[PDB]
Amino acid sequence: DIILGIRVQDSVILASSKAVTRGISVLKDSDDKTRQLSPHTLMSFAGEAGDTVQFAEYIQANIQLYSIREDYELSPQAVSSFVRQELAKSIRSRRPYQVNVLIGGYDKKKNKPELYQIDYLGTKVELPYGAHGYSYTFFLLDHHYRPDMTTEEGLDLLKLCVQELEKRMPMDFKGVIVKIVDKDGIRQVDD
Amino acid sequence: DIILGIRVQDSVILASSKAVTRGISVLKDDKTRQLSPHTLMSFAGEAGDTVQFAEYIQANIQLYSIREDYELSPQAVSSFVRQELAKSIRSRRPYQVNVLIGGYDKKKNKPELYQIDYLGTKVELPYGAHGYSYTFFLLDHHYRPDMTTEEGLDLLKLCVQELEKRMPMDFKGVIVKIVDKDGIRQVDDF
Amino acid sequence: LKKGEVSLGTSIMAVTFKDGVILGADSRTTTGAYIANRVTDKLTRVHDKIWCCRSGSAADTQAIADIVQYHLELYTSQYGTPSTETAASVFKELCYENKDNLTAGIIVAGYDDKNKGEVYTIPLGGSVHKLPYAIAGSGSTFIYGYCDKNFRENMSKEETVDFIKHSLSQAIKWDGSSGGVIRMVVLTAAGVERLIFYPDEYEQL
Amino acid sequence: LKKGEVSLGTSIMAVTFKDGVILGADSRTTTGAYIANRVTDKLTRVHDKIWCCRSGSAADTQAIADIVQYHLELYTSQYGTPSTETAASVFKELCYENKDNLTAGIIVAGYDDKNKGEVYTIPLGGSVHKLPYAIAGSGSTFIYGYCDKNFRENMSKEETVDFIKHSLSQAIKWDGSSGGVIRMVVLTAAGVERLIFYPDEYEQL
Amino acid sequence: MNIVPQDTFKSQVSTDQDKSVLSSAVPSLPDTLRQQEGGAVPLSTQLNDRHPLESTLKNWETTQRQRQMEQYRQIFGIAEPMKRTMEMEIVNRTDFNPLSTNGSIHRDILLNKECSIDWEDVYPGSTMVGDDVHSKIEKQLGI
Amino acid sequence: QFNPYGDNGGTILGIAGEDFAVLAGDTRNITDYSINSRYEPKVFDCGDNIVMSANGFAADGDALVKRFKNSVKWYHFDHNDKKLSINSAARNIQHLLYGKRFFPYYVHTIIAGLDEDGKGAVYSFDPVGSYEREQCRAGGAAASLIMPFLDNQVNFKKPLKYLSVEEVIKLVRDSFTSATERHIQVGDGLEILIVTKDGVRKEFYELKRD
Amino acid sequence: TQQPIVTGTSVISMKYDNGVIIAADNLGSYGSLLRFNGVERLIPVGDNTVVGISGDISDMQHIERLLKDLVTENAYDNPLADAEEALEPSYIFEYLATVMYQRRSKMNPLWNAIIVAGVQSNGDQFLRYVNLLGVTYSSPTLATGFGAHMANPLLRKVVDRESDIPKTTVQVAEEAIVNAMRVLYYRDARSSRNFSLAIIDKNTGLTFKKNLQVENMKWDFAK
Amino acid sequence: TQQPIVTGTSVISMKYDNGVIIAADNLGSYGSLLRFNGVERLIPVGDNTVVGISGDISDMQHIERLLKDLVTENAYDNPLADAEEALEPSYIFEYLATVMYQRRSKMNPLWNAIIVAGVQSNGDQFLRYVNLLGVTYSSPTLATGFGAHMANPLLRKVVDRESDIPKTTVQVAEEAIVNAMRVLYYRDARSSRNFSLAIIDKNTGLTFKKNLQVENMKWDFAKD
Amino acid sequence: SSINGGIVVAMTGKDCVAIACDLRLGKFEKIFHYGHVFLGITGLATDVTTLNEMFRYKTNLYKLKEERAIEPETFTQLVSSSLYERRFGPYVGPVVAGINSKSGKPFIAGFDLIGCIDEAKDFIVSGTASDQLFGMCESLYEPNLEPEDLFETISQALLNAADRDLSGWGAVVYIIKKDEVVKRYLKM
Amino acid sequence: AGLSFDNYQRNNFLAENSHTTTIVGVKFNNGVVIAADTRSTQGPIVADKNCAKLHRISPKIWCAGAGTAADTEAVTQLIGSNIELHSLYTSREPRVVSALQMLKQHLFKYQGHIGAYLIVAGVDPTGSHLFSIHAHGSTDVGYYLSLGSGSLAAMAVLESHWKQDLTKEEAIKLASDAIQAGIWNDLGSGSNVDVCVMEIGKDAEYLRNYTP
């Protein structure tokens, strides 16, 4: 369960690895570790099985309800704050569960991309780039990151990071599903 | 840490890892001891005790060969190794150790391979492996008692390719030695 | 017994004599090897002529005693003076129904015009027993045989006073948590009488 | 003590009187709640007029008693009849030098021409105390006050016999590890006398 | 006046604590080849994880004899333990049979074990090095 | 921590014929190395020609049997005294067992009767509820000493279909006698209930403990 | 609760040809200390039932309160409570077993062993045992605690099986019960010399004997 | 030993201008039971030295045996071992401290606290303390156990500094120590009313008082 | 290479014995002979080999000194003593079978890990499970069987045990008479 | 020498890694009787239905044990060898007191690690003796003793019907009845009864399967 998010000048790129289960062989083409919160806000999650998907679907249902009720789209900041509040409320009276969330959006009012990361305790931090899973790659991002990079440069950096992760992984690392959030909405890259 | 042994109809092929100790990176074989001109021993397991045991065994066997002016049979060598290993842990906590002994009995002109675990259970096997958690699938499906040395080398190369498919860059390679009627040789190309 | 509480390690006695009852105790409260309070009045009163002595946990026993005094005030407002049996029953019910949460043991002495003085004991657990005399506490174990060899039915007041004084003096002598002065309450038809005996008097016995 | 090891939950009383010493005990050996032996001879003879009673581990006390008897035989082969002080010293040395591995406690009652009968007590740990009288065991805790109140110096033989009988009867009554018959050994200048008392005798005291 | 053996542990350890198996090349280190203990037995392993009864058994009879000697010294004097020890030493020193480990008859008579059997007697107790007569001669004569 | 469970031993056996069923059990209730009772039945007639037996913790088995009997009584009250089938009873027992999934009964259950067609039927239940229909089932601490005897002296493929009730009774008696000889817990009696279209018949035999 | 504090030891009961006999000693022990003497551990319910309880004394008194409440409620509002509308031993045992199992399932059990003995209206003897786990069983002879290991063989020597019940007179059963109590007093550290006995007979009714002492003690084989 | 079984309560000592005063109660308690009432915990060693031991009774008796052996051996083969060969408190304390430390290093310590008091040959007061771990220290006032928490504050109000020693007389120090013993008897479950006192002076030489009881006890306010 | 554990069954027929042991197929047998005495050891493989070597040593010395082969009862006592020697470091389940050369009576016995002897007049089962196989042997055993009948019974018991839990399961059976010993293999 | 401690650490390592009766003695006016049951069980399974639990130390000194069977047998055999050697050395009939001393000292030497609880009966020229020996080295003297899992029923029977002056036949009957009660009322006891009777001046009489 490894998730990455890179924010470039005009868009946000989110990459997620194929979900696997212990002792179970599955062949499918789907993204079950990512939910589209809104046409311009995407969410990726990684953590314990069961709880994480329930939390993600709960968040998606709440955000869709708000969008229908108000006939308007929430900003990425408001979405991230709501997710943080709900995550803090979830472990209010129970043992905390492992979960890490990357939220990437394109604020139309500010006309700029944004990316946030929330850990299992409910700590929301705005980041230029972020990753979770294997604990290697932060040095590669640091040496090859610029705030004014284009989409193609971000995709090249993501390809380099994916190759580096695959090399260390014992060849069990399958493909990576890549999505781009920008002014035109959310799309998936099949390259 | 994986040690492999294949007994082909007229030879014994022993394969071992190159070198790894703690998190220290070294360039640099320290896992195979030549017990006799026609008998080789490959040891794997805990670092510090296995080397001492192997050196003790090699010293004893060399002393016997010097005294008798004769080469001890691989079966007797295996029995002595098993007895010494059982004696070493008779008054202390056992330590992880696995030994593969490959020899060529000149009196019978037959290759032989033996495996001894940490408690001292000697088993005569056509093929053996330790350190892999499997690899017995290839060693069982594509093994014949009448395989030539080239076929055994090809099977070992397939096993090494399988190993170099789910391991990091730390896997330096495999050191291969062959014991036969002409003695002990080291394989560089394969 | 919850950790860090206060234990009522003491020497409690109650003896029934011809004209009523006498309840006696020591005055030492210790926390480990340190005497926290060397002057303690352990003769708790729950009604005008119904008294009790407590053991176990101080907080639980005090709460139970307060509730019992409340209950007896309600009873007196309704029906009048209760008998010692009713007070013992209330004590037993309170101790038994909460025995999984509270550790408490009570010795109840009482007097009334019908029964003419009675002694009841509720040990840990909640059972009730009616006896001609009762002893309790950590220091009681050293006087058992003595109390079995010097008790007579229908003793006079002075004989009972001397018996209680001697037994409590021995218990104080042989127990580390028993000491100080001896306090005795005499419940008869005449009324309630208080007696205090100092170490220099009972240590010469 | 060790797991599964027999423990000596006895009642031991040694009393010095005008003409010598008397050592008495009960006869019960228990296994927690089941009585393994209803009749036991807990009075161990170390020398002709030097007897003892044991508490703690049974095996350790038996080994110590055997070694002390052997030592006293060796001493007698050289210098004649030993003294109670010598036997107590040997017991104390054996118990103290081995207290890290053996659990043992002894009560020694002796007689000799010089000292005219003496009592020594060696509790757990290996310290020797010379006392006019000594009590030990599980039941001894119930007769501390009684023995303290009813002990006199230079009593007659019958008075000491009655005192020990009453005290041991109370100890048997209040303790679950004390048995039926009472065995007493009287060591005087005339010789060694053995007395036995049955429950139907002392239960009616 | 001990009954159970005491002070059976070692206060200090060293690499040359056994002078009989010292290496000739480096006299400050043990010789593992002549030890014939398997070659993987460091001395440290002999300090931990031992049965709590082995020390009691291996030092039982010695402790009993020492207690007996102490009693003799206390009661009889110094001459009796001195004579007992002298006789035992004379018997032990004059017996040298490299081909057997069984004790002599006179030793058993002195120890009062003429008609006594223990598990030591029933179970008294290949190698390329150090199992010949010459090694025992060197050990006996301090060569 | 209070331990709510226990064990009382005992052995039960259920066999299905072609037109009958047999359920037998040893009538000895024992605690650890002590005999509580030399005659305590563990097989009961639970209504409409259905025999039930829960082996293991005695209190749990008694509670389960009591609950099932009350459920059968209310079933008769609700539906015009309709006869309860063996499969419906099996599902009822499954629900009763699974209703205590997190505080399970410490019993193994066997029931026997006749199916709709009229053949013998035996159902076996694990403590949490899972059940299946079997030709023969042995439960308790003697099954390893009873099943091989039956497999040796009869075939379930002399075929079991051709056996009569007397032969089945004889085989059960012989197997239980052998188990009594070999096993300490088994003995002191054997009660057998036979279910046919005529009803339920009870027989008793004395084993080697009196 | 978690453990008994003041405890009783043993109750022993037997069936004979005309009724049942039960017995139990009068003692409440505080650990190894024999603290309370004069504790009645046999409860006569009705004119034909006797309940013997061994174990925690407080729980025994609670069960006594429950039995008294049951007896009082039986007369509400039956005018024939002394008549054929009395309480059978089977009713009392069923109620007690239900209570014990319900409390066991609630993780707050009553640390007791209960033996219910009596004679039914038709004259059939009733004798059942229940414990803190709710385990119930019947037998011609029953006992609790150390009685279950020592007195039980002595009683079974008399009434070995069901066929021996009609052959056992009341005198034989009473003598066997007295001998078993004597053995228990011999070999039980927590036992007492004083005990109570109850005989329930379909002809003579209920006979309750108190202040019975163990006699014929053999201690002379010492010296 | 692994753990003590029969134990003592406390020993308190202080210095006055002409010597030292030490005191300790007489009681041996078996757990929570006050078993023995004749135990003496003050041992006069030599001519003008007193040793007070608190703790395990068996180890205290062992230490008493050691002190007796030391006294006998010092005078052994020395007919003039009475004026110049008399044992000084410093030597006895050094021996005891060395024994305690060596046994601590053996993992078999003596469960005791030892206070050595006396007057040196040149008239100087000596007062030192050692524990089971072998740690030793000196001070104008010393105490053990509960006396280290209650008796020490009372004694330091009389002798707080080294310059206060010449200002303190024998009567003042004795009264302070008696008051401290009375306070300890007030607020100690394991304490005993009886106690023993020892005054070591450079003029009189020694004064050992036994069978002293706590007097002037105030319990009248308990009437209210 | 796991070879720890196994099953050994010993039975007595009219004037013969039968000792059978499980195999693993996919060279390591658990039955050894020292003349006319057979020993089967189950448990740790290293302990089995050690006991085999030690008993070969002791039997060779016994034959050299006594000038005769050791009897099954004497060998049973020797095995018991050897097992009790390692009281605090005990090794396994040994089974001894044979026929006395003089009396001719069959003899079978079993041992625990510290040499407690259980002499059975009917049969001995040694192994880890020892529950299904024990029941099958109990059901199939009949006293006083002929060597052919005894062989059939023991082979059927082993086959039934094998059926109720493989690809590489085998068995070795010895039918021992006073003058002839027959060794057979079962391949299931 | 002696019992070995080898492979103790190996056994502990394997263990950490998941690699794993009624006897009575009755003393009568001219001798002693010792009786025992004859069932050997390996847990629930009855291994043998007729086993001899009466072992002999000396021709007139017998014993029966419980606990660890191997330890009991080994200790009994060793004490028998020592007793025979002592009798040969002294040319005298062995005494039960000597066997008691040897057993006590041997059991105390191992500090309870040798689990063997014994009832030892015998007759020597000084009289008849009956002792109970615990595994830690403590011995007790009594007139009637019981041992094993069925010892409670046996003790009840013995307490019911014991007198000071008993004949040989009465003692045999009492021992048989105690063993029978243990057999019937205890699951670990069963089968037949073995008896051994020892009088003064007469040979020991050993009756196997006295009551079948």
From Swiss-Prot, chain A:
GO terms for cellular component: cytosol; endoplasmic reticulum membrane; nucleus; proteasome complex; proteasome core complex, beta-subunit complex. One of its GO terms (biological process) is proteasome-mediated ubiquitin-dependent protein catabolic process. Keywords: Acetylation, Cytoplasm, Nucleus, Phosphoprotein, Proteasome. Disulfide bonds: none annotated. PANTHER family: METALLOPROTEASE TLDD (PTHR32194), PROTEASOME SUBUNIT BETA TYPE-1 (PTHR32194:SF2). Present with 21800 molecules/cell in log phase SD medium. Belongs to the peptidase T1B family. This is Proteasome subunit beta type-4.
Curated annotation (Swiss-Prot), chain E:
It comes from Saccharomyces cerevisiae (strain ATCC 204508 / S288c). Residues 1-35 are annotated as: Disordered. Present with 2740 molecules/cell in log phase SD medium. The keyword Chaperone applies. The keyword Transcription regulation does not apply. Residues 8-26 have a biased composition (Polar residues). This is Proteasome maturation factor UMP1. GO terms for biological process: DNA damage response; proteasome assembly; ubiquitin-dependent protein catabolic process. InterPro entries: Ump1. Belongs to the POMP/UMP1 family. Short-lived chaperone present in the precursor form of the 20S proteasome and absent in the mature complex. Required for the correct assembly and enzymatic activation of the proteasome. Also prevents premature processing of the PRE2 propeptide. The lineage of its organism: Eukaryota, Fungi, Dikarya, Ascomycota, Saccharomycotina. Seems to be degraded by the proteasome upon its formation. It comes from the Eukaryota. GO terms for cellular component: cytoplasm; nucleus. Keywords: Chaperone.
Swiss-Prot record, chain G:
Keywords: Cytoplasm, Nucleus, Proteasome. Its main location: cytoplasm. GO terms for biological process: proteasomal ubiquitin-independent protein catabolic process; proteasome assembly; proteasome-mediated ubiquitin-dependent protein catabolic process. One of its GO terms (cellular component) is nucleus. It is found in: Cytoplasm; Nucleus. Present with 16900 molecules/cell in log phase SD medium. The 26S proteasome consists of a 20S proteasome core and two 19S regulatory subunits. The 20S proteasome core is composed of 28 subunits that are arranged in four stacked rings, resulting in a barrel-shaped structure. The two end rings are each formed by seven alpha subunits, and the two central rings are each formed by seven beta subunits. The catalytic chamber with the active sites is on the inside of the barrel. Interacts with CIC1. This is Proteasome subunit beta type-7. It comes from Saccharomyces cerevisiae (strain ATCC 204508 / S288c) (Baker's yeast). The chain holds residues 34 to 256 of 266 of the full protein.
Curated annotation (Swiss-Prot), chain I:
The keyword Cytoplasm applies. CDD domains: proteasome_beta_type_3. InterPro entries: Ntn_hydrolases_N (IPR029055), Proteasome_beta_3 (IPR033811), Proteasome_bsu_CS (IPR016050), Proteasome_sua/b (IPR001353), Proteasome_suB-type (IPR023333). GO terms for biological process: proteasomal ubiquitin-independent protein catabolic process; proteasome-mediated ubiquitin-dependent protein catabolic process. It comes from the Eukaryota. Pfam families: Proteasome (PF00227). GO terms for molecular function: endopeptidase activator activity. There is a cross-link at residue 58 (Glycyl lysine isopeptide (Lys-Gly) (interchain with G-Cter in ubiquitin)). Belongs to the peptidase T1B family. The 26S proteasome consists of a 20S proteasome core and two 19S regulatory subunits. The 20S proteasome core is composed of 28 subunits that are arranged in four stacked rings, resulting in a barrel-shaped structure. The two end rings are each formed by seven alpha subunits, and the two central rings are each formed by seven beta subunits. The catalytic chamber with the active sites is on the inside of the barrel. This is Proteasome subunit beta type-3. It comes from Saccharomyces cerevisiae (strain ATCC 204508 / S288c) (Baker's yeast). The gene is PUP3.
